[PDB]
Design a protein around this ligand. Structure first.
Ligand SMILES: Cc1cc2nc3c(=O)[nH]c(=O)nc-3n(C[C@H](O)[C@H](O)[C@H](O)COP(=O)(O)OP(=O)(O)OC[C@H]3O[C@@H](n4cnc5c(N)ncnc54)[C@H](O)[C@@H]3O)c2cc1C
Ligand SMILES: Nc1ccccc1C(=O)O
Length: 447
């Protein structure tokens, strides 16, 4: 029997509140950014630091969706050669972020121990580490190695399973998503970025080959440069402009549990379904790392490209069916700019949490680490991500709409955000990007 519980719902933010910029929308701005998640915020910061006027529009709240809900481990381990620089450099930038902003984002360098199950897992770790070490850029060496024996058991204090070997990303980072993006938004505002919350962008008005303005629910702003960083909504937005983004929604659940004395520090990943990350506030983030695909219209429209991972391949995925299916066929995929858009209905969207998944991981954690028998659930939530089918983000100009740049479709945006924000700013301004964005182009879906 297929599950019936996964559901797309309107919700509230779980992240720190960020006040809207006061007053009327500006009549013009050098750049307008659609979306107040980490991608929109980091892009805005990079552009404002280069002297451009920037206005962010956010339909709900800052970090209301993915950026406020992430497990939020900041890592480079096992990344592809195309993605690795984005993560390596993202981490470099995160390590300088508190200094840059003059505040605490909650970013901490904490280290990540991933126990390895067998020789094949060990071989794969050693091979990645070897290759990553030689290509590590930005004059910063890779700080990832294999550990064992006394050192490993010290890291995994109290572990009931006698783990023998592990990959150790010693400089892995952590940011608490309730804190990070909102703190960055406050900094953006300090350097002159205007941020208007409860303000949906319905569309972009363009003629000849030139953007003239963005149309919001509260009026229009003149500009010839637009960044779409709309998270899971980017596909829908671009569909209204006749451009296809091949992204598919996936539902996730997350929780925080209370810290206890004797718990392992930092970030732990065990192959028996245990994944936790110590937060700056002393609680522990605990991820089931199980994916739920709620069957919708787009499951059929994009199925072929995903199939090597959508219900195929050996990844921990589950199908769900429910109201989403019928609702997905009712969701309009085009709207006039003078009428109510779907964005004004679902301002802070998420998926309902899976309590069974969250209970299961927490139990497994308690068995492996008995000190957590005295820990209790602090908070639980659901979330939606929207990857592409090829494990690469979309950071790209839109050839059909000169002036439009997209920064979206990543499941590693907490890590990538600072780097992708700089890359996006470079694309916007016509500067040679700090990282070659060719692999992240929309051109790769052509033909
Ligand atoms: C459960 C979970 C765990 C994760 N764990 C990790 C991790 O461990 N490490 C890691 O690096 N990454 C992780 N991620 C990924 C990371 O959270 C995302 O990749 C990142 O938050 C994406 O940022 P974004 O700004 O593109 O999207 P979002 O944070 O979703 O922001 C997009 C914003 O745009 C707004 N918006 C959309 N359309 C419009 C419109 N038309 N007008 C106005 N506003 C609009 C939305 O309301 C939203 O706030 C995780 C994600 C999830 C869901
Ligand atoms: N990076 C992610 C993206 C989506 C879901 C889980 C994770 C995770 O790291 O656990």
């Amino acid at each position: 029997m297929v599950r019936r519980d996964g559901k797309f719902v309107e919700s509230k933010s779980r992240a720190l509140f960020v006040e809207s910029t006061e007053g009327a929308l500006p009549s013009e701005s050098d750049v307008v950014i659609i979306g107040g998640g980490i991608q929109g915020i980091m892009t805005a910061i990079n552009l404002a630091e280069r002297g451009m006027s920037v206005t962010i529009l956010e339909k709900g709240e800052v970090a209301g969706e993915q950026s406020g809900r992430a497990y939020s481990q900041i890592i480079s381990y096992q990344t592809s050669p195309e993605i690795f620089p984005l993560h390596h450099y993202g981490k470099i930038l995160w390590r300088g972020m508190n200094e840059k902003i003059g505040a605490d984002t909650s970013y901490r360098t904490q280290g990540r121990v991933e126990a390895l199950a067998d020789e094949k897992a060990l071989d794969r770790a050693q091979e990645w580490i070897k290759t990553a070490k030689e290509t590590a850029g930005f004059d910063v060496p890779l700080n990832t190695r294999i550990i064992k024996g006394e050192e490993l058991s010290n890291r995994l204090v109290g572990a009931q399973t006698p783990w023998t070997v592990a990959a150790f990303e010693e400089d892995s980072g952590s940011v608490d998503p309730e804190t990070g993006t909102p703190t960055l938004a406050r900094y953006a505002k300090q350097i002159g970025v205007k941020i208007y919350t409860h303000c949906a962008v319905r569309g972009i008005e363009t003629a000849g080959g030139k953007i003239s303005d963005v149309v919001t629910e509260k009026g229009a702003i003149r500009t010839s440069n637009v960044v779409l960083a709309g998270g899971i909504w980017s596909r829908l937005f671009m569909g209204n402009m006749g451009v296809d983004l091949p992204t598919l929604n996936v539902y996730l659940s997350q929780q925080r549990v209370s810290g206890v004395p004797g718990a392992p520090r930092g970030n732990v990943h065990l192959p028996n379904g245990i994944h936790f990350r110590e937060q700056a506030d002393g609680t522990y983030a605990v991820a089931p790392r199980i994916f739920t695909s709620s069957i919708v219209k787009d499951s059929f429209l994009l199925g072929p490209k995903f199939m090597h991972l959508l219900g195929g391949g050996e990844l921990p995925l589950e199908f769900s069916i429910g109201e989403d299916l019928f609702n997905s066929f009712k969701m309009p995929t085009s709207w006039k700019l003078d009428e109510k858009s779907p964005f004004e209905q679902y301002r802070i969207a998420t998926a309902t949490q899976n309590t069974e998944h969250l209970d299961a991981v927490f139990q497994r954690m308690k068995t492996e680490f008995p000190v957590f028998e005295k820990s209790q659930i602090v908070e639980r939530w659901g979330a939606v991500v929207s990857p592409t089918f090829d494990e690469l983000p979309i950071i790209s100009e839109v050839k059909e709409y000169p002036g439009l740049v997209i920064n979206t479709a990543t499941v590693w945006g907490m890590t990538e955000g600072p780097a992708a924000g700089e890359v996006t700013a470079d694309i916007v301004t016509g500067k040679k990007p700090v990282i070659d964005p060719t692999p992240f182009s929309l051109d790769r879906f052509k033909k």
